[PDB]
Curated annotation (Swiss-Prot), chain B:
This is Outer capsid protein lambda-2. Belongs to the orthoreovirus lambda-2 protein family. It is found in: Virion. Coiled coil: none annotated. Outer capsid protein involved in mRNA capping. Catalyzes the last 3 enzymatic activities for formation of the 5' cap structure on the viral plus-strand transcripts, namely the RNA guanylyltransferase, RNA-7N- and RNA-2'O-methyltransferase activities. Changing K196A: 90% loss of autoguanylylation activity. Interacts with protein mu-NS; in viral inclusions. Changing K189A: Complete loss of autoguanylylation activity. Changing K170A: Almost complete loss of autoguanylylation activity. The record marks K189 as: Involved in formation of the phosphoamide bond.
Curated annotation (Swiss-Prot), chain D:
Belongs to the orthoreovirus sigma-1 protein family. It comes from Reovirus type 3 (strain Dearing). InterPro entries: Sigma_1_2_reovir (IPR004317). Gene3D superfamilies: 1.10.287.1520. The gene is S2. This is Inner capsid protein sigma-2.
């Protein structure tokens, strides 16, 4: 059960890219959602701070 | 989608057009022996980190090196190896042209096994004069070697109606191959005798041969 | 012994070379044909009938009046062995008492 | 050479199962638990010197049919699409190994569970089972016997034999080997050829293949009456002193009186008996067995679909669209054909013909009575014990007793020369 189509592709880009989400009518419990995030969370870590004022 | 540990892209694509065959003639043998332009019958392989050349890949007349490396007397460098090959092939070309006049035998085919074996024997300093009468096909590429009982076991032999041939080297390892993480993989084709080939006309005879032979 | 990355090329180069020599220049096994099964049959249990296995590669002779030849596998092994002996004998670390 | 390895199983005779039961199976395996019985068969018929008879195996054809039934019933376990061997039983029997060496009695847990229910007239391929495909020598060694079974089970009549005439078959080595068999009976030669075939499979055009084809041609040409002492085929022929008897003996002989002129070229045909008399004639059974043992190494011409029943049609390597037909004869009329051909050639008188025909009539009377009585006993047993339902001999009908196409096959075999 396949389709005939070559492996077209893109190249390596050394920069992070902007992203914006789209939602759907699917519904889930908020306490469940936070349970997964804490499981997948990459924290703790020390970030760079930057500048409040320039 | 997943096959043990490897992932698949969920779409298919295969080649649809195929080229044609081309016979191997005496003129093309001479031209390959010439190696004057960048038409040399070998190509270089480079390291990915230090960009230096570490091996060579071999082509039509050069695929016959089955003895150990020291017997061939190759130099460790690339440029010296290139010079050595050019010189020896130049000498062998005239030794061949001595036997076969160019205006007479221009339009005839060559026995490829014999070309590879002759080149290898010439480089290794074996008696190569026996192979020379076999350098032009007369009846059939396989049949001529089958019908000749007087040959050299260094290259090929006959088991009834099956021709056993020693598979030659594909890659030749220069001095710089340190088994690096960027050294190209040679896939065990740089060894002395990594395989054996059996040639015939019908697959039925081949499998009825491997009946008796151990697999 | 299985993988050569576990041996340091700077600490034990001699053993690195010896392992490489063993791994790529050990003799190859072979087989020959024998017997006449049309009367005697065969008693080969695990190998196929008519086949005799050897640990050393075999090549038939072309000439009935032989003269010395060194292209045989056994001489090639001895050549590796003698070269490897020469490496550690030439050592300046071995020589002082000699 | 041969590229396909298909075979066909036995078909029910109106019963609800394969016509073999536990009693007959234990009778077969009393001295050896191997389902491949072809050697033990040869020890039972005793070189064909007399009329072999047992309580459960009244004839030789009975044993041949029962071997066919056992193989057809039992080989359906490992040939299921799941290809498992040691999980279920067929009539208290299970397989010893994945390589099908022999049969043993099922363990108690398998005895508690039910048995496989086999089906009639199945066609199987040897390459489907992995352990057969892996080992070629094993496949050929068993396919010889499977070819013999298919030759019995292809049609409703007796076994099928193959006859070939060709001049280029003969060579120096064939002459050298053939001279050694002078003075031997047909059964002895068949025994030795079968053992040699068992030990080592034959080349496509080997000495043994051409030898056995020549032997079959000699036997059938002598059987019809074309070739005798006074008209030889390169001095070789087969001789019977007691034509028409219940257990005939044919002896290979050499004679220098004459040599028949032979047309060049290659010719062949398939012949078979239709009357039930073949159940007691060992030479015909052995001829079919020799053809079966040959079929492994070579490829025979296809048989036409119009000479075989419907279920046995379009088998990949056996039957085809416009192949050769089958030539069927029945025994009693062929004796008249033999005597007539000899008398026309001038080497036999009328009184000798009279004596031969009288002896053959007595023999046929005895054989017909015995076969009908055994059929009646089997019917009675099948009615008494509905849980057994067995057959001791291949079924037949009354219409098979009449002659049919006998003259045609006789003429064709005489026209092979």
């Amino acid at each position: 059960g396949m389709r005939i189509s070559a492996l077209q592709s893109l190249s390596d880009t050394p920069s992070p890219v902007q992203w914006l989400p789209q939602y759907t009518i699917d519904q889930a419990a908020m306490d469940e959602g936070d349970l997964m995030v804490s499981r997948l969370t990459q924290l703790p870590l020390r970030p760079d701070y930057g500048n409040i004022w320039v | 989608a997943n096959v043990w540990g490897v992932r698949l892209a969920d779409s298919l694509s295969s080649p649809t057009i195929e080229t044609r065959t081309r016979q191997y003639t005496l003129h093309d043998l001479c031209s390959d022996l010439d190696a004057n332009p960048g038409r040399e019958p070998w190509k270089p392989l480079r390291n990915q980190r230090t960009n230096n050349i570490v091996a060579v890949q071999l082509f039509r007349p050069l695929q016959g090196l089955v003895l150990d490396t020291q017997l061939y007397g190759f130099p460790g460098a690339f440029d010296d190896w290139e010079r050595f090959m050019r010189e020896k092939l130049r000498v062998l070309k005239y030794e061949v042209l001595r036997i076969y006049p160019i205006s007479n035998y221009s339009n005839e085919h060559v026995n490829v096994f014999v070309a590879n074996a002759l080149v290898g024997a010439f480089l290794s300093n074996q008696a190569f004069y026996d192979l020379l009468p076999l350098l032009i096909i007369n009846d059939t590429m396989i049949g001529d070697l089958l019908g000749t009982g007087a040959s050299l076991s260094q290259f090929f032999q006959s088991h009834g109606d099956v021709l056993e041939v020693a598979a030659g080297r594909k890659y030749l390892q220069m001095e710089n191959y340190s088994n690096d993480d960027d050294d190209p993989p040679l896939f065990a084709k740089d060894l002395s005798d990594y395989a054996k080939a059996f040639y015939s006309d019908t697959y039925e005879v081949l499998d009825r041969f491997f009946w008796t032979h151990d697999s | 012994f299985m993988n050569i990355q576990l041996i340091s090329p700077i600490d034990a180069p001699i053993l690195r070379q010896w392992a490489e020599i063993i791994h790529r220049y050990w003799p190859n096994p072979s087989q020959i044909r024998y017997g006449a099964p049309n009367v005697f049959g065969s008693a080969n249990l695990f190998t196929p009938p008519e086949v005799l296995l050897l640990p050393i590669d075999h090549q038939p002779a072309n000439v009935t009046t032989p003269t010395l030849d060194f292209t045989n596998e056994l001489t090639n092994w001895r050549a590796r062995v003698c070269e490897l002996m020469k490496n550690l004998v030439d050592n300046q670390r071995y020589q002082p008492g000699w | 050479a041969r590229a396909a390895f298909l075979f066909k199983t036995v078909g029910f005779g109106g019963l609800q199962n394969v016509p073999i039961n536990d009693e007959l199976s234990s009778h077969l395996l009393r001295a050896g638990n191997s389902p491949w019985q072809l050697t033990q068969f040869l020890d039972w018929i005793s070189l064909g010197r007399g009329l072999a008879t047992s309580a459960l195996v009244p004839t030789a054809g009975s044993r041949y049919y029962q071997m066919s039934c056992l193989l057809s019933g039992t080989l359906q376990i490992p040939f299921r699409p799941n290809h498992r061997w040691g999980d279920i039983r067929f009539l208290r029997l299970v397989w010893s190994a994945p390589t099908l060496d022999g049969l043993v009695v099922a363990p108690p847990q398998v005895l508690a569970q039910p048995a496989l229910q086999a089906q009639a007239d199945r066609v199987y391929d040897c390459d489907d089972y992995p352990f057969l495909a892996r080992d070629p020598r094993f496949k050929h060694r068993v396919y010889q016997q499977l070819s013999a079974v298919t030759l019995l089970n292809l049609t409703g009549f007796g076994p099928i034999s193959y006859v070939r005439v060709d001049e280029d078959m003969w060579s120096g080595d064939v002459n050298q080997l053939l001279m050694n068999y002078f003075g031997h009976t047909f059964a002895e030669i068949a025994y030795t050829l079968c053992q040699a075939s068992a030990n080592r499979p034959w080349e496509y055009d080997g000495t043994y293949a051409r030898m056995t084809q020549i032997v079959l041609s000699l036997f059938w040409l002598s059987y019809v009456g074309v070739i005798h002492q006074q008209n030889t085929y390169r001095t070789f022929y087969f001789q019977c002193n007691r034509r028409g008897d219940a257990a005939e003996v044919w002896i290979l002989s050499c004679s220098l009186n004459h040599s028949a002129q032979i047309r060049p070229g290659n010719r062949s045909l398939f012949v078979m008996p239709t009357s039930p008399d073949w159940n007691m004639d060992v030479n015909l059974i052995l001829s079919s067995t020799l053809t079966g043992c040959l079929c492994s190494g070579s490829q025979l011409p296809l048989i036409d679909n119009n000479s075989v029943p419907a279920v046995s049609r379009n088998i990949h390597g056996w039957t085809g669209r416009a192949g050769n037909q089958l030539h069927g004869f029945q025994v009693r009329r062929m004796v008249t054909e033999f005597c007539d051909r000899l008398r026309r050639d001038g080497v036999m008188t009328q009184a000798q013909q009279n004596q031969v025909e009288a002896l053959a009539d007595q023999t046929q009377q005895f054989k017909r009575d015995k076969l009908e009585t055994w059929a009646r006993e089997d019917d009675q047993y099948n009615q008494a014990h509905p849980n057994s339902t067995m057959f001791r001999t291949k079924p037949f009908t009354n219409a098979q007793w009449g002659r049919g196409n006998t003259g045609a096959t006789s003429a064709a075999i005489a026209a092979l020369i």
